[PDB]
C-alpha cells in the first residue's frame, strides 16, 4: 500500500526554523496533490499547505511564515518554516491525495519560548 | 479588402494557457500553443497560438498577461525547431513562418527583463517535391505545379467556432482587510466571488468594493473574473461559460492551395548499347529516384532509390523498355538486330 | 469535483484540393483520334470505335 512518512520534526525555540521531509514509497505525486496538515494537541486536523503541479496555496494562519515545495524526481515534499512560535507546537502529517487518500503517520513539532 | 477580412477578428482576445516546458519548467504562459499543422511542401508552417497578431495594425502582437493586454511588434519574437526559423505573415491566432524540419519545436520572446519561451514536441517534417529527395530548396530548375499553404488571409470554406470567454479565479483581486476578506474587483467591470467560510455564500459585487465578515482567511472565497464580450476559441486549457456553449463560427487564415515550385534537376547519366544489352553509369548528387519498367503486358517494375553513384546492367528486347530519371521525362527505347 | 471530457473527429480543412477518391471502374470504351487520306480527300477526325 501507499505509505507516507514524514521527517525533520523535532524540538526548537521561538523565532527559529525547521525543515520537515516527507517522502512516498514509489511515484505518486503526479496523479495525486499533497497537502501538509496539522493537528494540534486535541483538535482535529487543519491545513497548513497544499501543492499542485500548477501552483501552491498557504494558509493564512501560517502565510508569510510556511512555504510548501514539491520535488518529484526524489519522490519527496518539503515544507520550510521560519519564525516558529509556541503556538506551533503540533503532529505534522503529509497527506497524499487524489483518487484514494493516504495519511502520514505524523512528526512531532515544538516550539519553546 | 484587406480591413473587411481583418474585422472579424475583433471579436475575441488573447488568453494564457499551460505550456509545459517553460524557461524553467511548466507555466501558463501567455504565447500557449493550441496546435501546429504542416502539410506543405517547403516547409512553410502554420502555426496555432493564443495571442492576437495585427492588432489595424502592421507588424505586432497583442496578448494577455494576468488580465492586462499588452501589444509588442513582431520583430521582438523568435523561435526555431533546432536551427532558426523566419517568420513570413500572422493573423488572428494563427502564424504561417518558414521552418526547418525537427521533431519539436520552440517560440521565444524577451520583456523588458523576462523571458517567455515554450516548447512542445510536435514533429516538424519536411516533404520534398518530385522523384529528388533534396533537403533544401534549390535555386533553379524546371517549374510543376505544388501544394503550399497561402500567404494571404483570403476567405474561404473553412469555419471554427468560438465561444463565451470563461470564469477565472483571480488571487490578487482577492485580499486582506484590516478585519475582513477583501474583494475590490478592477473599477468599471462585474464580478463574482464564492465563499463557502460561514454558510454557502455566492455574491456578485458590481463596482463596489465589498468586505466580507465571518470570512477570516482569504483561502475560503475565490473571486471570478466576468466578460460579457470578447467570443473565446474552443480550447481546452481554458475553462466553458453558460449558455449554449456557442456563439458562431469564423473563417480560417492561411489555407492549403496551390502555387507553382521548382524543383532540382538531376545531371544526364552515362548510357551505353549492346547486344540486348544496356549499361548505365549513374552519379547522383543527391538520392533521387530511378523508375525503369518493360513496355509489354509484364511490367517487371522496378522502383529504386539511388543515392551513390553506380554501375548498372540491363537488358532491352525488340518489344521496347522505358525509364524514368529523377524529374527528368520519361525515355523509350526499341531494339534490334545486329 | 468532477469533469467531463468530450472529444470527436473531423476532416482537416486542408484537404479541400488534396484529398484521395474512391472509385469504382467497369465498362470501358475506345476512342480514336485519326488523319484520314483516301483519293487525296484528308481528313482529321475523331470517332468511336
Redesign the interface.
Known amino acids: 500500500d501507499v505509505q507516507l512518512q514524514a521527517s525533520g520534526g523535532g524540538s526548537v525555540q521561538a523565532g527559529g526554523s525547521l525543515r520537515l521531509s516527507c517522502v512516498a514509497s514509489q511515484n505518486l505525486f503526479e496523479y495525486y496533490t499533497m497537502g501538509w496538515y496539522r493537528q494540534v494537541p486535541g483538535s482535529q486536523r487543519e491545513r497548513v499547505a497544499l501543492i499542485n ?2 501552483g501552491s ?1 498557504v ?3 501560517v ?1 508569510g511564515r510556511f512555504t510548501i515545495s514539491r520535488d518529484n524526481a526524489k519522490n519527496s515534499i518539503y515544507l520550510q518554516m521560519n519564525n516558529l512560535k509556541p503556538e506551533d507546537s503540533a503532529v505534522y502529517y503529509c497527506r497524499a491525495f487524489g483518487p484514494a487518500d493516504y495519511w502520514g503517520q505524523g512528526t512531532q513539532v515544538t516550539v519553546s519560548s | 479588402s484587406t480591413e473587411e477580412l481583418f474585422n472579424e477578428y475583433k471579436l475575441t482576445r488573447p488568453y494564457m494557457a ?1 505550456c509545459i516546458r517553460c524557461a524553467v519548467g ?1 507555466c ?1 504562459s501567455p504565447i500557449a500553443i493550441e496546435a501546429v499543422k504542416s502539410d506543405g511542401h517547403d516547409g512553410y508552417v502554420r502555426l496555432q497560438t493564443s495571442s492576437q497578431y495585427g492588432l489595424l495594425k502592421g507588424r505586432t502582437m497583442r496578448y494577455d498577461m494576468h488580465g492586462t493586454i499588452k501589444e509588442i511588434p513582431l520583430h521582438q519574437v523568435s523561435l526555431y525547431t533546432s536551427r532558426p526559423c523566419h517568420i513570413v505573415d500572422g493573423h488572428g491566432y494563427f502564424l504561417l513562418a518558414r521552418c526547418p524540419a525537427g521533431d519539436s519545436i520552440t517560440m521565444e520572446f524577451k520583456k523588458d527583463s523576462v523571458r517567455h519561451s515554450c516548447s512542445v514536441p510536435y514533429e516538424v517534417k519536411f516533404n520534398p517535391v518530385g522523384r529528388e529527395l533534396y533537403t533544401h530548396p534549390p535555386e533553379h530548375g524546371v517549374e510543376q505545379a505544388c501544394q503550399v499553404y497561402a500567404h494571404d488571409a483570403q476567405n474561404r470554406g473553412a469555419y471554427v467556432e468560438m465561444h463565451l470567454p470563461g470564469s477565472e479565479v483571480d488571487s490578487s483581486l482577492v485580499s486582506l482587510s484590516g478585519s475582513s476578506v477583501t474583494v475590490t474587483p478592477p473599477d468599471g467591470t462585474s464580478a463574482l466571488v464564492e465563499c463557502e467560510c460561514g454558510g454557502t455564500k455566492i455574491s456578485e459585487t458590481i463596482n463596489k468594493t465589498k468586505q466580507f465578515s465571518q470570512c ?4 475560503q472565497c475565490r473571486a471570478y473574473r466576468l466578460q460579457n464580450d470578447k467570443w473565446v476559441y474552443n480550447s481546452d486549457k481554458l475553462p466553458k461559460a453558460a449558455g449554449a456553449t456557442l456563439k458562431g463560427k469564423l473563417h480560417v487564415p492561411f489555407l492549403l492551395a496551390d502555387g507553382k515550385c521548382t524543383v532540382p534537376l538531376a545531371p544526364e547519366p552515362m548510357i551505353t548499347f549492346g547486344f540486348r544489352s544496356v549499361s548505365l553509369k549513374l552519379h547522383p548528387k543527391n538520392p533521387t529516384y530511378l523508375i525503369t519498367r518493360q513496355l509489354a503486358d509484364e511490367p517487371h517494375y522496378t522502383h529504386e532509390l539511388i543515392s551513390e553513384p553506380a554501375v548498372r546492367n540491363f537488358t532491352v528486347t525488340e518489344k521496347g523498355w522505358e525509364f524514368v530519371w529523377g524529374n527528368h521525362p520519361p525515355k523509350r527505347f526499341w531494339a534490334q538486330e545486329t | 469535483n468532477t469533469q467531463v471530457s468530450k472529444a470527436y473527429v473531423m476532416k482537416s480543412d486542408d484537404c479541400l484540393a488534396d484529398h484521395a477518391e474512391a472509385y469504382k471502374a467497369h465498362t470501358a470504351s475506345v476512342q480514336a483520334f485519326l488523319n484520314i487520306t483516301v483519293g487525296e480527300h484528308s481528313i482529321v477526325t475523331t470517332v468511336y470505335v
Do not use: I
Not at chain 2, 477570516?216 to 483561502?219: A, G, P, V
Open positions: 503541479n500548477g496555496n494558509a493564512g494562519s502565510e | 499551460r511548466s501558463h477570516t482567511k482569504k483561502e
